[PDB]
């Protein structure tokens, strides 16, 4: 009968597939591709979970900071996503893809140049990732009490973004884009352990750092006070992680210490990893909002939506909601002093919510969308491509003209 | 130098660059940026040859910004940090620049229009108490832009680093009800050029790297006569792509970021500014004037400041005005456009006209006593000395 | 229901309701906001344009366009959305059923009347219509046939004397100086303290400041020295972001432009001389009747101290024998609509309409004959 649309959120770490109308994706696979190490030999490849285990194949990660770097592989990564996993005849199903805000236009052009010419799709919509994550939260919210106005923090593996949304419209010229994400946290734990805990095989340092990050890590109120708690009372704060070697099948054990709070700290002290960035995320959010119009500053502080897998850290919003309320209650205090102290202005109600769906938040906002009829109007079309060309998909809301 | 030998000094005290010199000067003595830099330790940089003071200022800071945390005291014509602004004035009056004695000199200053009053009162409070200047005057940036051009009638366009203001004059009669300010200038462009370079992967987050992008702007960026023709060049060719080498040796490449950044003076919505550009604002300022004065404004449009030095700005400005004259005055009569007389004074010395005009008004009024504002007057009256200028303060 | 409808269509506000009623049913600003960003969240009632209070709720992401300026309509496409928002959404009535009574200031271009009457029939299919002067309706609500009205709104300010239902058009005077010219002047002097308001939305904030803290000074030069000495007039205002401001001298310098337009550069004379000079153009016999029956109208006349400053200045010009009595009812912001419900509720008025068939035979130019 009438067929639903295909939805694909190709992220740095993990890739989210499925068809519209559904609540959770049909597949969630790493954004990896295993190749051998002319003719039909370019088809000897595997992607996803079928790529890690392959011994005689080389695993490649074609996506960095949300952008694609090798379109020779991503054109092979997408022809298994369609013909193996989804099993879709692309000439029938429309498509919804996702980009980060700072995706170059030439990457949007080569995307559409691939889908429309190679795969011959009849439609395509390249949406912004974190914007779809806000529509998902509104379903958790009461019906009718939907807050169209909200701020979004979407941090995954590649890059972190702060995107305000006011009355449904995206304030694109105030977006910020922090390059710190779950890959920088992982390589920082992968560093601390190489210095202290030798005995981790080099092939299993990454596997060991994600495991520490996902399980043991957390967020601290103050940094230097945690170092003392780990030193003065070490039995309570130092955990232990037993792994398994893949060659000898013998166990290896380590002690998990300062890397429990030091990884996530780079959200707030990003000069730990990247010296080209110093501002915390608690301050990036204040500049995003204070650069927005004066009327939608209060509703944006009151709905700050954490999305992405690298916001699952324990006590992430509790500190962000606290670093802001310090910053917001002072600014109002200073104005009250310069004016003359005659009016005590109303305080601002900061609120940082962390909604139930994070591993497939962006996909869900793409499935709700694609299941509408409005999607089939804004979708660029095969006809429009033949006439106007691949520059039909050149523009994004982050810029004008 | 006046009759009494007292040197007469002219300091612009701009938002991005200081222009200091003496009266009658046809150039300025020193032109240096208005920044103050304190030392800092960074892991990437290693230097132990040059001594780094605790307070570096001006050219010796911007040159050594790699080892510094620079900070601009002034923003959008307004002074934020006085303790960093006095350290700049000292450098401006010291052995490194204009080694003068303040107690035996006269000074002429400038403030932009429709600024707060406490920013003017607090400057005069500083020149008579801290430096104890003998004679002070606070001029209008527009009127000075005419003295250098040798005029009495002309709508001024003065765009700098923080402020872009428009002030019409007619035979020396101020019309402050027509003064307008656009909130866009060379600093709001320099930010937009970083937000564009960020798409290529170049990150300039630090305070020192803000100057590095200014130099990238002053060198490469320009204005497009017909923005459609420029977009064809960037889509069809790759000749606009230039290269800039940074202090750390890293090379970058800059293309369509050259005409897109300063287009925010004419399409200001690209930086989240609601309103109209410098052309549709200059045409609407004139159309507010008395109908008999409009004919002499089009003939005497005067540019100034260093944000008017984008290659192609006056030609672009002449174009957009004639499109509006055709569309709103003439209602679409191309045949009458030949009679439309417009002349945009774009002299290449328009970078310093607010200073040159201050050299001209000083040399004309150096030897008069009813013009300046004396230390004795400030001791007696206080900030009410400004009533000589007509500025109502108490 | 066969009740007639009434619509003021001022420069700033649209006051609407039914005939026979005592106060209007719908009051909203005459603005049409179009967004300034690209809405990527789909299926979220993201419309191409917003009107009325739905715009002021979303002013942050919009460019508010007043389609009327100094009484004239500049954008007719947007003005259809205003009337369409009035009938279908606010009043919830079809316009073809009832008639409508419109208003207009004097000495406007004839093309403005020609277009309204063309729109009510060809677009809305009204059965008839009528176009009245705004000042004349203010006297119907005042319960008089003798008196000079000074309606001061958002864009226009005009005087109209009448004597026993006989209007003197040779004495009518208009002055393009009103609240929107004062709002803009307030934004220019607020920079002196350090408060910058440029955006259209920020212009609506300053409007709320103007109509909450600005008063008229009985003696301008006297209160000028009061503020210089003390800090009694220093009132404060809380912006929606939580910031706070304080204004002293700027509370009475804004409305003084009505009495000293030289601040705005305008060569014109103040309202205190305009209404006086109008009276001097009337007959010498009827001046005394108008010095007593001096009425005010329009939202701009809601400043405190406006009645006392007019009475003071008028007394200083006119002879000491004539007694100056100002009339300033506490509903003068809606007087022009109140008279409209009165005038349409009369039996004598049922013939002054311009029916559908009369416009069909004479075209839109009939408005010049029917509507004075």
């Amino acid at each position: 009968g009438r067929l639903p649309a295909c939805v694909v959120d190709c992220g740095t770490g993990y890739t989210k597939l499925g068809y519209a109308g559904n609540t959770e994706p049909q597949f969630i696979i790493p954004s990896c591709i295993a190749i051998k190490e002319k003719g039909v030999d370019d088809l000897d490849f595997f992607i996803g979970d079928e790529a890690i285990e392959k011994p005689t194949y080389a695993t490649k990660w074609p996506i960095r900071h949300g952008i694609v770097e090798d379109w020779d592989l991503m054109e092979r990564f997408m022809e298994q996503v369609i013909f193996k996993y989804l099993r879709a005849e692309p000439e029938d199903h429309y498509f919804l893809l996702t980009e980060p805000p700072l995706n170059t236009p030439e990457n949007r052009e080569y995307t559409a140049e691939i889908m429309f010419e190679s795969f011959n799709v009849p439609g395509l919509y390249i949406a912004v990732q974190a914007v779809l994550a806000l529509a998902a939260s509104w379903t958790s919210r009461q019906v009718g009490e939907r807050t169209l106005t909200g701020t979004v923090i979407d941090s995954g593996d590649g890059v972190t973004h702060v995107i305000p949304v006011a009355e449904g419209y995206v304030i694109g010229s105030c977006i910020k884009h922090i390059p710190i994400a779950g890959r920088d946290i992982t390589y920082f734990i992968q560093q601390l352990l190489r210095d202290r805990e030798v005995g981790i095989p080099p092939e299993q340092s990454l596997e060991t750092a994600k495991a520490v990050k996902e399980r043991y890590s957390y967020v601290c109120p103050d940094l230097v006070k945690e170092f003392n708690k780990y030193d003065t009372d070490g039995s309570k704060w130092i955990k232990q992680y037993t792994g398994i070697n893949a060659i000898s099948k013998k166990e290896f054990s380590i002690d998990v210490g300062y890397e429990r709070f030091l990884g996530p700290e780079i959200f707030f002290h990003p000069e730990f990893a990247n010296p080209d960035f110093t501002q915390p995320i608690s301050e990036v959010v204040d500049e995003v909002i204070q650069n927005c119009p004066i009327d939608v500053r209060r509703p944006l502080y009151k709905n700050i939506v954490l999305s992405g897998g690298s916001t699952m850290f324990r006590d992430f919003g509790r500190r962000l909601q606290r670093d802001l309320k310090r910053t917001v209650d002072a600014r109002l205090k200073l104005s009250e002093e310069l004016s003359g102290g005659r009016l005590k202005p109303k305080p601002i109600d900061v609120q940082v919510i962390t909604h139930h769906m994070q591993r497939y938040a962006v996909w869900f906002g793409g499935s709700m969308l694609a299941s509408t009829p409005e999607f089939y109007q804004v979708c660029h079309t095969k006809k429009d491509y033949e006439e106007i060309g691949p520059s039909i998909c050149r523009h994004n809301p982050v810029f004008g003209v | 130098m006046d009759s009494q030998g007292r040197k007469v000094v002219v300091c612009d005290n701009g938002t991005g660059f200081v222009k200091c010199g003496y009266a009658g000067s046809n150039f300025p003595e020193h032109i240096f940026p208005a920044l103050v830099g304190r030392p800092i330790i960074r892991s990437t940089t290693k230097v132990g040859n040059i001594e780094i003071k605790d307070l570096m200022v001006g050219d010796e800071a911007s040159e050594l910004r790699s080892m510094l945390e620079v900070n601009y005291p002034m923003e959008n014509g307004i002074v934020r940090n006085w303790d960093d602004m006095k350290h700049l004035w000292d450098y401006t009056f010291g052995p490194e620049k204009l080694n003068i004695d303040t107690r035996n000199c006269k000074i002429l200053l400038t403030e932009p229009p429709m600024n707060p009053t406490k920013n003017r009162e607090k400057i005069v409070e500083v020149m008579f108490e801290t430096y104890q200047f003998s004679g002070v005057y606070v001029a209008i940036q527009a009127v000075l832009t005419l003295y250098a051009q040798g005029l009495l009638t002309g709508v001024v366009v003065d765009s700098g680093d923080g402020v872009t203001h428009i002030c019409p004059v007619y035979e020396g009669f101020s019309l402050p009800h027509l003064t307008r300010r656009l909130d866009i200038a060379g600093r709001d462009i320099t930010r937009y050029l970083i937000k564009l370079l960020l798409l290529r992967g170049y990150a300039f987050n630090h305070s020192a790297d803000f100057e590095t992008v200014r130099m990238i702007k002053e060198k490469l960026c320009y204005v497009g006569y017909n923005i459609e023709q420029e977009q064809k060049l960037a889509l069809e060719t790759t000749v606009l792509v230039e290269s800039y080498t940074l202090p750390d040796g890293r090379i970058i490449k800059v293309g369509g970021e050259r005409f897109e950044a300063p287009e925010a003076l004419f399409q200001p919505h690209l930086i989240n500014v609601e309103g109209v550009g410098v052309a549709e604002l200059l045409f609407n300022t004139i159309q507010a004037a008395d109908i008999d004065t409009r004919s002499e404004f089009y003939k005497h449009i005067v540019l100034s400041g260093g944000s008017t030095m984008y290659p192609g700005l006056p030609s672009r400005l002449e174009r957009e005005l004639k499109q509006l004259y055709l569309e709103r005055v003439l209602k679409g009569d191309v045949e009458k456009l030949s009679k439309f007389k417009i002349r945009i004074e774009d002299p290449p010395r328009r970078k310093h006209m607010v200073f040159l005009g201050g050299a001209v008004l000083a040399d004309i009024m150096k030897d008069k006593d009813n013009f300046w504002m004396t230390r004795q007057e400030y001791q007696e009256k206080g900030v009410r000395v400004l009533e000589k200028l007509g500025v109502t303060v108490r | 229901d066969i009740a007639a409808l009434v619509v003021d269509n001022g420069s700033g506000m649209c006051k609407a309701g039914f005939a026979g009623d005592d106060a209007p049913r719908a009051v909203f600003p005459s603005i049409v906001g179009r967004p300034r960003h690209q809405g990527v969240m789909v299926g979220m009632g993201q419309k191409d344009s917003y009107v009325g209070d739905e715009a002021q709720s979303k002013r942050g992401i919009l460019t508010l366009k007043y389609p009327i300026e100094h009484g004239i309509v500049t954008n007719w496409d947007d003005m259809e959305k205003i009337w369409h928002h009035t009938f279908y959404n606010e009043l919830r009535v079809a316009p073809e059923e009832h008639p409508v009574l419109l208003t207009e200031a004097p000495l406007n271009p004839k093309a403005n009347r020609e277009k309204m009457t063309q729109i009510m029939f060809e677009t809305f299919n009204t059965p008839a219509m009528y176009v009245a002067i705004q000042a004349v309706l203010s006297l119907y609500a005042s319960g008089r046939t003798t008196g000079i009205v000074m309606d001061s709104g958002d864009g226009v300010t005009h005087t109209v004397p009448i004597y026993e239902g006989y209007a003197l058009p040779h004495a009518i005077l208009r002055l393009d100086l009103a609240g929107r010219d004062l709002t803009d002047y307030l934004m220019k002097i607020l920079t002196e303290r350090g408060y910058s308001f440029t955006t259209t939305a920020e212009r609506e904030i300053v409007r709320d400041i103007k109509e909450k803290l600005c008063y008229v000074a009985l003696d301008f030069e006297q209160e000028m020295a009061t503020a210089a000495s003390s800090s009694s007039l220093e009132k404060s205002y809380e912006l929606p972001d939580g910031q706070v401001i304080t204004i002293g001298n700027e509370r009475f310098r804004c409305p003084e432009a009505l009495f000293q337009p030289s601040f705005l550069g305008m060569e014109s004379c103040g309202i205190h001389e305009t209404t006086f000079n109008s009276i001097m153009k009337c007959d010498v016999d009827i001046r005394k009747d108008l010095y007593a029956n001096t009425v005010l109208s329009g939202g701009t006349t809601m400043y405190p101290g406006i009645a006392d400053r007019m009475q003071k200045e008028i007394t200083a010009l006119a002879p000491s024998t004539m007694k100056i009595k100002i009339i300033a009812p506490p509903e003068r912001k809606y007087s022009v609509w109140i008279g409209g419900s009165i005038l349409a509720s009369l039996s004598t008025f049922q013939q002054m309409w311009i029916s559908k068939q009369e416009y069909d035979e004479s075209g839109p130019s009939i408005v010049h004959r029917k509507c004075f």
Partner: peptide, 7 residues
């Protein structure tokens, strides 16, 4: 500035 804009 004090209100509106930074300066």
């Amino acid at each position: 500035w004090x209100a509106x804009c930074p300066a």
